[PDB]
Design a binder for these strands. Structure first.
Ligand SMILES: [Mg+2]
Ligand SMILES: [Mg+2]
Ligand SMILES: [Mg+2]
Ligand SMILES: [Mg+2]
Ligand SMILES: [Mg+2]
Ligand SMILES: [Mg+2]
Ligand SMILES: [Mg+2]
Ligand SMILES: [Mg+2]
Ligand SMILES: [Mg+2]
Ligand SMILES: [Mg+2]
Ligand SMILES: [Mg+2]
Ligand SMILES: [Mg+2]
Ligand SMILES: [Mg+2]
Ligand SMILES: [Mg+2]
Ligand SMILES: [Mg+2]
Ligand SMILES: [Mg+2]
Ligand SMILES: [Mg+2]
Ligand SMILES: [Mg+2]
Ligand SMILES: [Mg+2]
Ligand SMILES: [Mg+2]
Ligand SMILES: [Mg+2]
Ligand SMILES: [Mg+2]
Ligand SMILES: [Mg+2]
Ligand SMILES: [Mg+2]
Ligand SMILES: [Mg+2]
Ligand SMILES: [Mg+2]
Ligand SMILES: [Mg+2]
Ligand SMILES: [Mg+2]
Ligand SMILES: [Mg+2]
Ligand SMILES: [Mg+2]
Ligand SMILES: [Mg+2]
Ligand SMILES: [Mg+2]
Ligand SMILES: [Mg+2]
Ligand SMILES: [Mg+2]
Ligand SMILES: [Mg+2]
Ligand SMILES: [Mg+2]
Ligand SMILES: [Mg+2]
Ligand SMILES: [Mg+2]
Ligand SMILES: [Mg+2]
Ligand SMILES: [Mg+2]
Ligand SMILES: [Mg+2]
Ligand SMILES: [Mg+2]
Ligand SMILES: [Mg+2]
Ligand SMILES: [Mg+2]
Ligand SMILES: [Mg+2]
Ligand SMILES: [Mg+2]
Ligand SMILES: [Mg+2]
Ligand SMILES: [Mg+2]
Ligand SMILES: [Mg+2]
Ligand SMILES: [Mg+2]
Ligand SMILES: [Mg+2]
Ligand SMILES: [Mg+2]
Ligand SMILES: [Mg+2]
Ligand SMILES: [Mg+2]
Ligand SMILES: [Mg+2]
Ligand SMILES: [Mg+2]
Ligand SMILES: [Mg+2]
Ligand SMILES: [Mg+2]
Ligand SMILES: [Mg+2]
Ligand SMILES: [Mg+2]
Ligand SMILES: [Mg+2]
Ligand SMILES: [Mg+2]
Ligand SMILES: [Mg+2]
Ligand SMILES: [Mg+2]
Ligand SMILES: [Mg+2]
Ligand SMILES: [Mg+2]
Ligand SMILES: [Mg+2]
Ligand SMILES: [Mg+2]
Ligand SMILES: [Mg+2]
Ligand SMILES: [Mg+2]
Ligand SMILES: [Mg+2]
Ligand SMILES: [Mg+2]
Ligand SMILES: [Mg+2]
Ligand SMILES: [Mg+2]
Ligand SMILES: [Mg+2]
Ligand SMILES: [Mg+2]
Ligand SMILES: [Mg+2]
Ligand SMILES: [Mg+2]
Ligand SMILES: [Mg+2]
Ligand SMILES: [Mg+2]
Ligand SMILES: [Mg+2]
Ligand SMILES: [Mg+2]
Ligand SMILES: [Mg+2]
Ligand SMILES: [Mg+2]
Ligand SMILES: [Mg+2]
Ligand SMILES: [Mg+2]
Ligand SMILES: [Mg+2]
Ligand SMILES: [Mg+2]
Ligand SMILES: [Mg+2]
Ligand SMILES: [Mg+2]
Ligand SMILES: [Mg+2]
Ligand SMILES: [Mg+2]
Ligand SMILES: [Mg+2]
Ligand SMILES: [Mg+2]
Ligand SMILES: [Mg+2]
Ligand SMILES: [Mg+2]
Ligand SMILES: [Mg+2]
Ligand SMILES: [Mg+2]
Ligand SMILES: [Mg+2]
Ligand SMILES: [Mg+2]
Ligand SMILES: [Mg+2]
Ligand SMILES: [Mg+2]
Ligand SMILES: [Mg+2]
Ligand SMILES: [Mg+2]
Ligand SMILES: [Mg+2]
Ligand SMILES: [Mg+2]
Ligand SMILES: [Mg+2]
Ligand SMILES: [Mg+2]
Ligand SMILES: [Mg+2]
Ligand SMILES: [Mg+2]
Ligand SMILES: [Mg+2]
Ligand SMILES: [Mg+2]
Ligand SMILES: [Mg+2]
Ligand SMILES: [Mg+2]
Ligand SMILES: [Mg+2]
Ligand SMILES: [Mg+2]
Ligand SMILES: [Mg+2]
Ligand SMILES: [Mg+2]
Ligand SMILES: [Mg+2]
Ligand SMILES: [Mg+2]
Ligand SMILES: [Mg+2]
Ligand SMILES: [Mg+2]
Ligand SMILES: [Mg+2]
Ligand SMILES: [Mg+2]
Ligand SMILES: [Mg+2]
Ligand SMILES: [Mg+2]
Ligand SMILES: [Mg+2]
Ligand SMILES: [Mg+2]
Ligand SMILES: [Mg+2]
Ligand SMILES: [Mg+2]
Ligand SMILES: [Mg+2]
Ligand SMILES: [Mg+2]
Ligand SMILES: [Mg+2]
Ligand SMILES: [Mg+2]
Ligand SMILES: [Mg+2]
Ligand SMILES: [Mg+2]
Ligand SMILES: [Mg+2]
Ligand SMILES: [Mg+2]
Ligand SMILES: [Mg+2]
Ligand SMILES: [Mg+2]
Ligand SMILES: [Mg+2]
Ligand SMILES: [Mg+2]
Ligand SMILES: [Mg+2]
Ligand SMILES: [Mg+2]
Ligand SMILES: [Mg+2]
Ligand SMILES: [Mg+2]
Ligand SMILES: [Mg+2]
Ligand SMILES: [Mg+2]
Ligand SMILES: [Mg+2]
Ligand SMILES: [Mg+2]
Ligand SMILES: [Mg+2]
Ligand SMILES: [Mg+2]
Ligand SMILES: [Mg+2]
Ligand SMILES: [Mg+2]
Ligand SMILES: [Mg+2]
Ligand SMILES: [Mg+2]
Ligand SMILES: [Mg+2]
Ligand SMILES: [Mg+2]
Ligand SMILES: [Mg+2]
Ligand SMILES: [Mg+2]
Ligand SMILES: [Mg+2]
Ligand SMILES: [Mg+2]
Ligand SMILES: [Mg+2]
Ligand SMILES: [Mg+2]
Ligand SMILES: [Mg+2]
Ligand SMILES: [Mg+2]
Ligand SMILES: [Mg+2]
Ligand SMILES: [Mg+2]
Ligand SMILES: [Mg+2]
Ligand SMILES: [Mg+2]
Ligand SMILES: [Mg+2]
Ligand SMILES: [Mg+2]
Ligand SMILES: [Mg+2]
Ligand SMILES: [Mg+2]
Ligand SMILES: [Mg+2]
Ligand SMILES: [Mg+2]
Ligand SMILES: [Mg+2]
Ligand SMILES: [Mg+2]
Ligand SMILES: [Mg+2]
Ligand SMILES: [Mg+2]
Ligand SMILES: [Mg+2]
Ligand SMILES: [Mg+2]
Ligand SMILES: [Mg+2]
Ligand SMILES: [Mg+2]
Ligand SMILES: [Mg+2]
Ligand SMILES: [Mg+2]
Ligand SMILES: [Mg+2]
Ligand SMILES: [Mg+2]
Ligand SMILES: [Mg+2]
Ligand SMILES: [Mg+2]
Ligand SMILES: [Mg+2]
Ligand SMILES: [Mg+2]
Ligand SMILES: [Mg+2]
Ligand SMILES: [Mg+2]
Ligand SMILES: [Mg+2]
Ligand SMILES: [Mg+2]
Ligand SMILES: [Mg+2]
Ligand SMILES: [Mg+2]
Ligand SMILES: [Mg+2]
Ligand SMILES: [Mg+2]
Ligand SMILES: [Mg+2]
Ligand SMILES: [Mg+2]
Ligand SMILES: [Mg+2]
Ligand SMILES: [Mg+2]
Ligand SMILES: [Mg+2]
Ligand SMILES: [Mg+2]
Ligand SMILES: [Mg+2]
Ligand SMILES: [Mg+2]
Ligand SMILES: [Mg+2]
Ligand SMILES: [Mg+2]
Ligand SMILES: [Mg+2]
Ligand SMILES: [Mg+2]
Ligand SMILES: [Mg+2]
Ligand SMILES: [Mg+2]
Ligand SMILES: [Mg+2]
Ligand SMILES: [Mg+2]
Ligand SMILES: [Mg+2]
Ligand SMILES: [Mg+2]
Ligand SMILES: [Mg+2]
Ligand SMILES: [Mg+2]
Ligand SMILES: [Mg+2]
Ligand SMILES: [Mg+2]
Ligand SMILES: [Mg+2]
Ligand SMILES: [Mg+2]
Ligand SMILES: [Mg+2]
Ligand SMILES: [Mg+2]
Ligand SMILES: [Mg+2]
Ligand SMILES: [Mg+2]
Ligand SMILES: [Mg+2]
Ligand SMILES: [Mg+2]
Ligand SMILES: [Mg+2]
Ligand SMILES: [Mg+2]
Ligand SMILES: [Mg+2]
Ligand SMILES: [Mg+2]
Ligand SMILES: [Mg+2]
Ligand SMILES: [Mg+2]
Ligand SMILES: [Mg+2]
Ligand SMILES: [Mg+2]
Ligand SMILES: [Mg+2]
Ligand SMILES: [Mg+2]
Ligand SMILES: [Mg+2]
Ligand SMILES: [Mg+2]
Ligand SMILES: [Mg+2]
Ligand SMILES: [Mg+2]
Ligand SMILES: [Mg+2]
Ligand SMILES: [Mg+2]
Ligand SMILES: [Mg+2]
Ligand SMILES: [Mg+2]
Lengths: 272, 45
RNA sequence: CCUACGGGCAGGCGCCGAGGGUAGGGCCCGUGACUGGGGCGAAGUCGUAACAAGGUAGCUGUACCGGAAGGUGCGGCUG
RNA sequence: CGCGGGGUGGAGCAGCCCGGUAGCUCGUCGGGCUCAUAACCCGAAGGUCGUCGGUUCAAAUCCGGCCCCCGCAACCA
RNA sequence: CGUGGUUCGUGGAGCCAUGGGGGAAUCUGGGCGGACCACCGCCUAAGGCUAAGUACUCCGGGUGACCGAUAGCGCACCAGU
RNA sequence: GGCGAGCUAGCCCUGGCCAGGGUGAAGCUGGGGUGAGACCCAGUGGAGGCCCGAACCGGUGGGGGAUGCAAACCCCUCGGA
RNA sequence: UGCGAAUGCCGGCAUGAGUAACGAUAAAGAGGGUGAGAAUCCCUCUCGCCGUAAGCCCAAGGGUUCCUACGCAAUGGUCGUCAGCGUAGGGUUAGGCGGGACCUAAGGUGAAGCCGAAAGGCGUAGCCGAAGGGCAGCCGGUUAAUAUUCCGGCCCUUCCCGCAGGUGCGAUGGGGGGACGCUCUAGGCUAGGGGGACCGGAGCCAUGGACGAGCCCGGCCAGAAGCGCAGGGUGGGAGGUAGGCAAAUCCGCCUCCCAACAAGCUCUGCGUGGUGGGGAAGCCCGUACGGGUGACAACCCCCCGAAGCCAGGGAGCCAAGAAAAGCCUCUAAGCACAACCUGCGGGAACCCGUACCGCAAACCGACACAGGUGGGCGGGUGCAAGAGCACUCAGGCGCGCGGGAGAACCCUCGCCAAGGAACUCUGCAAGUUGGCCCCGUAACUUCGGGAGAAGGGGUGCUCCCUGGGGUGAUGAGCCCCGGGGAGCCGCAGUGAACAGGCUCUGGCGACUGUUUACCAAAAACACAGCUCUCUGCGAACUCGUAAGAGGAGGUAUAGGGAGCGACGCUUGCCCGGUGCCGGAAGGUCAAGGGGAGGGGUGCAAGCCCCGAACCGAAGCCCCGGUGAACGGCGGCCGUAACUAUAACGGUCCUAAGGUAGCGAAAUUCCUUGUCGGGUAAGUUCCGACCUGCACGAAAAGCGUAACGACCGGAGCGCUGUCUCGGCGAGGGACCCGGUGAAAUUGAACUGGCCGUGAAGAUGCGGCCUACCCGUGGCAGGACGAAAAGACCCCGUGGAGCUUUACUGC
RNA sequence: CACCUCGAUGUCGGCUCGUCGCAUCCUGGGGCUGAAGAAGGUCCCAAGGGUUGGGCUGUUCGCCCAUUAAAGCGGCACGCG
């Protein structure tokens, strides 16, 4: 769980790489069920609209299955576990008895060989998807839907998961990775287990280059600019903020809440 | 050292050519203007 | 050069070689602006920590804090 | 030389604006409690208000001059 | 209610237009005469067309107290070269 | 109101390039070690914004040039590779 | 309608001036020829320079520059008979090369559809889009000039028709395949190269020797099928089937049974192959280039050997590495006297490019410009290797002014006695060092480093003996790593060329990286990493009027914003003010509601206008919280049994009065503080003290190994830096022939002193000095040139930037 | 102070090259002395010539080391880009 290196170069001294033992025989990444070509692109129609992106290794997309109700009843065999560059979590290749193949975001524990399945039926065991209402209160789940039939959206990042805290009406109360207490419709599919590859949070990029491989170009502080182009640029030399800390566009960036208040979603939430 | 002019037949046509001029409303005016002035060449050769 | 000459001596070269030189290490001693605590010194300053529930039982390993003794936390010992 | 502030019992601070009244803590002195000291309690004394002028009926107070005190300023060069 | 137009810059601010809200009547119905009311008058909104008198000069011609090759059009000449 | 990313900056798609030498990570195999281990040793192995240095990319110090060979150049030197 | 001025405008001609220059210091010399004319054109001979080029081949760009004849006014930095120049004529040949009647990539365009005052913006399919995918030509000959294009030889593709043989044929649809990274790398080949005592070949014996296993030259290229050698790809059969938006017999999944190997099948590379073709030196021809002979040329062995080929080869690794068509399979309509598949035969096969330059005199730089320009080839020997360095092959060049001379001075070089940093802001500069092998190597450390630490020894040639490996048969030969021994020569053996000076000690930044294109490369930016904060997903945020899009085909181990900046030990107190966060109360508050009451006009019903109470958001007030939020973090006085100092005390104020650590510092004013160290001497440097004008904890505090073309201090080494200069070399300067600029310029017949003058006089006064005109030199003056001062002020001139300035959006 | 110069009179220090003044640092000649001698003190004459090398700092200056007959002051656009 996490590789170290001997300091045979600086930066290698602190550099740390993911363990890839979980990766069942793998390298080629299963054409057909994905990949699709993924359009590396750092702007919209012309203009940069997210700073400091671009470059970094080319990458093939894996079209994964964020709606398991797609094949209720039909069981599948876990054929493989493989590396997916487009996400922190790792993916499992599912061989359905239909002869259909699909990638699922691999949960912790999921071993190659297991049968897996989705539906109101379905044995509450890691890898299986069900509508939320039919899941035992207190069970930890992942890849949750937020509205019935709209595909999984919550708890998918490596290591994450939601907890089921109780039910009330057509909804059940989830505790999301953020710590928020959310009502979600009971018909929304989730899948038992936590996400897995939870040592992800413990890698140390080690050097600037590494950030670059991940498509992350250097980020420059407002402090290092001029008044023309940031609320923090100017002085002679070093200089405190001399105002409440701001973003390039003028807004405050320390505590100033930003969620739209009158959002209809408001009456389905209750936490941090 | 490397100067500013770096000739490239395709770029030139793609940028100043007749067809490119006819797409933009602004371009169509460049033609209108040159045609009215009596230019012998409405577009780079 | 000498013969008692298929030799000896002078003389030449080589080895090692006292030591001198260049360079880098190791141990010990002396000394140094300044700095750390320590001991000792008839009658200096500040408090009162301990000895009698020592007037907050005490001591204790650790940790933080405070002019100072010390105080507090955690656990321990009863002396 | 500039600008602002300040000088009041032995110490440190009020009162100066809005003229007529000098007030606070500490200290000092006398007496209590103690075997004694300190703490504590009861009493008390002590200042012309930096200085020299002027205004006023009257000046710590309002005005001007000198003397010090604190702080800021002294940039293009 | 919010604006534009008119000489009208919110003014006593009508008139004409209209983005928003409300929302009629058919001659005894409606609009206007500078807030508003009365009176007295003018005129018939929410469909459309309509010559001529008017503007201009790429073009043709006629004229000049207009230029005469550094002038006159940038070009009298193969110049928008 | 238009013209410009054929210079320059960033990004996107598709190709190309980096003489030669050095250092010798993990892993692996073996031996030792232990109750089992950690671990040690040898070989093997060939990692790295690792080392030296051409191409290539630079532009550090000095000299020259200054109506220049040059509206940024030349020589020596130097950085990355 | 009158010009002398406007750093006026257009034009012409002057001055500087026969002056600077004539564009890389790779270099020239003679003979012959041509011609009106020759250093400059042609030819020969000699000399020099490039050779990972300064040679050759592509791609861009250029667009007649190409070959030939005639020619020299201009262009050519001189000349010109010459030319890339003037005139004319000629020259570019493709089913197989490149591109198009193929494919898709970013992106572009865009039926449907969405949005926008108009213009127009978006957008699924589709279409366009290439140096990527797909796709059939190799060798040689020929022209003044084109050639994989013409030709010769051998070989191949598609399309149409027909014949035969085979099969359910049939697509834009289903499936497979195409199909993919980086580093390292095996086997076998090829290109390429070396050697040969072997094969072929004109000749050669000089100058002392050599007729010799001598010298010199050459010893190949292409090639179907078949055949070998080496590799790539691939399991076969059966049953079940609900998945691959219809249907599949195909693919997927399951079961069973046979191979598990490349066996077989298939594809590629290389060898061989019918035949075809090339074929040196030297000599002879005339060139302006080529042509004859050599020739019935020979045409073979050995060795080195790729980064290229077999190719979709193998291993490892993480950052996880296009698409679509061709192709194959599957079935659907449909058709199955169709159709498709195989073989053979006959016919058919279009458009564009093709000259020449292409690291450059033909491209980008106003120039025949010392700059810039992407891909491939790039031989030999030596040097550890190499594309490095020296010389050299093929090939190509001497750079389009020359001849002299031998000053100063300048540039680029070489050497220097004694000294050796005394130079200077500084060892700036230069020198020293320098490759390989061996011995050897400290503090400290994050255990990797520091290390090429430092400091040393070896280094050539000759003979003798000897180990191991590759290729061959184990063998010889050839090639490759060595080892031991005895000797030879010089001042010197990496004998030339390419090739670190070293150490000690501070500051800043952890580090590799990034930057002010053209005065700053840094202690600035970035960086892994730490913290705060926002964001539940139609996320926040960003772009846009919108649609839409980025975020992300991501989902809190994620994304945005901010500060800090590896790592180590740490990061204190203040929430009074400002920000942000929380607070269903209360205060205030707009439109609106509400209307108590009032007013205008009517005879009146009425019409019309004001208008209190009270009910009405956010915001603000108010109550709280919050420090890796903006920020802030005290004054006077006294006191100890020498003195001094003050652990202690009094009092005033605050939201709280600066903790650790550090400190004359990238911070210290006084200041060269004081003391110690270094030095003969130290305003700097190092250590320390603390009186911190005016350090102090994520605008982080204090340290830290390694790292640095950063900045400081010291020493050793070595020196022309210096005492202090000297000599020498070459390119200029100078003279002669050719060509011939420039800024500047009121006109000039343009001297010194002491005065005077708008206060610094060639130009005025007095006196002094002084025949007329040049050339080489120096730079004191002409308030010398250049630029309508950038500093300063002024203008109710401008512009970028800020904020609790104003007012808006 | 603001008179020439803002359609430009380049600014400290060093280097180089000097030239001039004398109110003389040394050497020469003097008077006086509280001048025994030697050595000084002070004033007068005198500008011919001479007036060192180093450490520190950008420094001028100054401090210091080692010498010296002496380690002189000033002007020349604080002489001289
Ligand atoms: Mg666009
Ligand atoms: Mg992390
Ligand atoms: Mg940053
Ligand atoms: Mg900046
Ligand atoms: Mg901008
Ligand atoms: Mg701003
Ligand atoms: Mg700021
Ligand atoms: Mg600052
Ligand atoms: Mg370049
Ligand atoms: Mg051009
Ligand atoms: Mg140009
Ligand atoms: Mg092109
Ligand atoms: Mg139109
Ligand atoms: Mg025409
Ligand atoms: Mg020793
Ligand atoms: Mg001591
Ligand atoms: Mg002591
Ligand atoms: Mg006690
Ligand atoms: Mg106690
Ligand atoms: Mg007690
Ligand atoms: Mg006790
Ligand atoms: Mg304790
Ligand atoms: Mg303490
Ligand atoms: Mg205290
Ligand atoms: Mg306890
Ligand atoms: Mg007092
Ligand atoms: Mg009063
Ligand atoms: Mg009292
Ligand atoms: Mg008393
Ligand atoms: Mg007074
Ligand atoms: Mg008085
Ligand atoms: Mg200023
Ligand atoms: Mg109006
Ligand atoms: Mg008004
Ligand atoms: Mg108006
Ligand atoms: Mg009316
Ligand atoms: Mg309306
Ligand atoms: Mg009516
Ligand atoms: Mg009317
Ligand atoms: Mg009317
Ligand atoms: Mg009508
Ligand atoms: Mg009408
Ligand atoms: Mg009409
Ligand atoms: Mg008219
Ligand atoms: Mg006309
Ligand atoms: Mg006339
Ligand atoms: Mg004319
Ligand atoms: Mg004219
Ligand atoms: Mg005329
Ligand atoms: Mg006209
Ligand atoms: Mg004209
Ligand atoms: Mg014409
Ligand atoms: Mg560009
Ligand atoms: Mg290359
Ligand atoms: Mg590579
Ligand atoms: Mg290597
Ligand atoms: Mg073992
Ligand atoms: Mg090894
Ligand atoms: Mg190993
Ligand atoms: Mg090895
Ligand atoms: Mg490297
Ligand atoms: Mg390096
Ligand atoms: Mg280096
Ligand atoms: Mg290097
Ligand atoms: Mg340079
Ligand atoms: Mg620079
Ligand atoms: Mg220079
Ligand atoms: Mg220079
Ligand atoms: Mg180098
Ligand atoms: Mg280099
Ligand atoms: Mg005139
Ligand atoms: Mg005049
Ligand atoms: Mg002259
Ligand atoms: Mg001359
Ligand atoms: Mg000349
Ligand atoms: Mg020459
Ligand atoms: Mg020639
Ligand atoms: Mg010739
Ligand atoms: Mg072309
Ligand atoms: Mg021509
Ligand atoms: Mg020609
Ligand atoms: Mg001719
Ligand atoms: Mg001519
Ligand atoms: Mg000529
Ligand atoms: Mg020329
Ligand atoms: Mg002739
Ligand atoms: Mg011609
Ligand atoms: Mg070709
Ligand atoms: Mg083609
Ligand atoms: Mg056709
Ligand atoms: Mg096409
Ligand atoms: Mg297409
Ligand atoms: Mg439209
Ligand atoms: Mg569009
Ligand atoms: Mg599109
Ligand atoms: Mg291609
Ligand atoms: Mg391919
Ligand atoms: Mg082709
Ligand atoms: Mg040929
Ligand atoms: Mg040719
Ligand atoms: Mg042919
Ligand atoms: Mg048939
Ligand atoms: Mg059928
Ligand atoms: Mg397909
Ligand atoms: Mg190989
Ligand atoms: Mg060959
Ligand atoms: Mg060969
Ligand atoms: Mg022979
Ligand atoms: Mg013969
Ligand atoms: Mg002879
Ligand atoms: Mg013979
Ligand atoms: Mg031979
Ligand atoms: Mg041979
Ligand atoms: Mg060959
Ligand atoms: Mg062959
Ligand atoms: Mg099978
Ligand atoms: Mg099947
Ligand atoms: Mg189906
Ligand atoms: Mg089959
Ligand atoms: Mg095989
Ligand atoms: Mg072959
Ligand atoms: Mg064959
Ligand atoms: Mg033959
Ligand atoms: Mg033949
Ligand atoms: Mg021949
Ligand atoms: Mg000819
Ligand atoms: Mg492979
Ligand atoms: Mg298609
Ligand atoms: Mg079929
Ligand atoms: Mg045929
Ligand atoms: Mg051609
Ligand atoms: Mg050609
Ligand atoms: Mg060529
Ligand atoms: Mg070049
Ligand atoms: Mg080049
Ligand atoms: Mg090239
Ligand atoms: Mg060439
Ligand atoms: Mg040429
Ligand atoms: Mg030339
Ligand atoms: Mg050139
Ligand atoms: Mg050119
Ligand atoms: Mg260059
Ligand atoms: Mg080669
Ligand atoms: Mg070579
Ligand atoms: Mg040799
Ligand atoms: Mg070498
Ligand atoms: Mg070379
Ligand atoms: Mg040659
Ligand atoms: Mg020549
Ligand atoms: Mg030349
Ligand atoms: Mg030499
Ligand atoms: Mg010397
Ligand atoms: Mg010597
Ligand atoms: Mg020495
Ligand atoms: Mg000196
Ligand atoms: Mg010195
Ligand atoms: Mg310096
Ligand atoms: Mg230094
Ligand atoms: Mg140097
Ligand atoms: Mg030498
Ligand atoms: Mg050197
Ligand atoms: Mg060693
Ligand atoms: Mg080491
Ligand atoms: Mg060190
Ligand atoms: Mg060494
Ligand atoms: Mg050595
Ligand atoms: Mg020798
Ligand atoms: Mg062998
Ligand atoms: Mg071999
Ligand atoms: Mg052998
Ligand atoms: Mg030997
Ligand atoms: Mg020797
Ligand atoms: Mg070196
Ligand atoms: Mg320090
Ligand atoms: Mg750095
Ligand atoms: Mg760069
Ligand atoms: Mg750069
Ligand atoms: Mg720059
Ligand atoms: Mg600039
Ligand atoms: Mg989106
Ligand atoms: Mg997306
Ligand atoms: Mg964040
Ligand atoms: Mg920073
Ligand atoms: Mg820092
Ligand atoms: Mg703090
Ligand atoms: Mg406190
Ligand atoms: Mg606060
Ligand atoms: Mg608060
Ligand atoms: Mg607050
Ligand atoms: Mg609030
Ligand atoms: Mg309220
Ligand atoms: Mg109201
Ligand atoms: Mg109302
Ligand atoms: Mg009424
Ligand atoms: Mg209210
Ligand atoms: Mg407030
Ligand atoms: Mg309360
Ligand atoms: Mg005392
Ligand atoms: Mg005593
Ligand atoms: Mg006493
Ligand atoms: Mg105290
Ligand atoms: Mg402080
Ligand atoms: Mg402190
Ligand atoms: Mg300390
Ligand atoms: Mg100091
Ligand atoms: Mg400071
Ligand atoms: Mg000393
Ligand atoms: Mg000292
Ligand atoms: Mg300094
Ligand atoms: Mg001060
Ligand atoms: Mg600071
Ligand atoms: Mg601070
Ligand atoms: Mg802070
Ligand atoms: Mg520090
Ligand atoms: Mg660096
Ligand atoms: Mg540096
Ligand atoms: Mg020194
Ligand atoms: Mg010299
Ligand atoms: Mg010479
Ligand atoms: Mg001449
Ligand atoms: Mg004269
Ligand atoms: Mg005068
Ligand atoms: Mg006169
Ligand atoms: Mg005169
Ligand atoms: Mg004369
Ligand atoms: Mg002269
Ligand atoms: Mg002069
Ligand atoms: Mg001169
Ligand atoms: Mg001037
Ligand atoms: Mg001016
Ligand atoms: Mg203004
Ligand atoms: Mg004046
Ligand atoms: Mg005046
Ligand atoms: Mg002037
Ligand atoms: Mg005198
Ligand atoms: Mg005197
Ligand atoms: Mg005397
Ligand atoms: Mg005397
Ligand atoms: Mg005497
Ligand atoms: Mg110095
Ligand atoms: Mg002096
Ligand atoms: Mg001084
Ligand atoms: Mg002087
Ligand atoms: Mg002065
Ligand atoms: Mg002076
Ligand atoms: Mg001066
Ligand atoms: Mg200068
Ligand atoms: Mg100067």
């Amino acid at each position: 769980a996490v590789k170290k290196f001997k300091p045979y170069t600086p930066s290698r001294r602190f550099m740390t790489v993911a363990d890839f033992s979980e990766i069942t025989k793998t390298e080629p990444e299963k054409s057909l069920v994905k990949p699709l070509k993924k359009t590396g692109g750092r702007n919209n129609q012309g203009r940069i609209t997210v700073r400091f992106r671009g470059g970094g290794h080319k990458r093939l997309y894996r079209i994964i299955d964020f709606k398991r109700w797609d094949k209720v009843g039909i069981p599948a065999k876990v054929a493989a576990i493989e590396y997916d560059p487009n996400r922190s979590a790792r993916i499992a290749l599912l061989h359905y008895v239909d002869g259909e193949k699909r990638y699922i975001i691999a949960p912790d524990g999921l071993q190659v060989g297991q049968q897996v399945v989705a539906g109101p039926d379905a044995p509450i065991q890691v890898g299986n998807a069900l509508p939320l209402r039919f899941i035992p209160v207190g069970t930890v789940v992942h890849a949750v839907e937020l509205e019935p039939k709209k595909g999984a959206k919550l708890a998918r990042a490596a290591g994450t998961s939601a907890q089921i805290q109780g039910r009330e009406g057509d909804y059940v109360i989830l505790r999301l990775p953020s710590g928020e207490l959310r009502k979600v419709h009971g018909e929304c599919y989730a899948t038992v287990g936590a996400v897995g590859n939870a040592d992800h949070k413990n890698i140390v990029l080690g050097k600037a280059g590494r950030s670059r491989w991940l498509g992350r170009r250097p980020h420059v502080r407002g402090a290092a600019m001029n008044p023309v182009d940031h609320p923090h640029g100017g002085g002679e030399g070093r200089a405190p903020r001399g105002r409440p800390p701001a973003s390039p566009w003028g807004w405050q960036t320390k505590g100033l809440k930003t969620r739209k208040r009158r959002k209809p979603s408001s009456r389905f939430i209750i936490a941090r | 050292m490397k100067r500013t002019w770096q000739p490239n037949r395709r770029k030139r046509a793609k940028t100043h050519g007749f067809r490119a001029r006819m797409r933009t409303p602004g371009g169509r005016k460049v033609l209108k203007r040159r045609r009215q002035k009596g230019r012998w060449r409405l577009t780079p050769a």
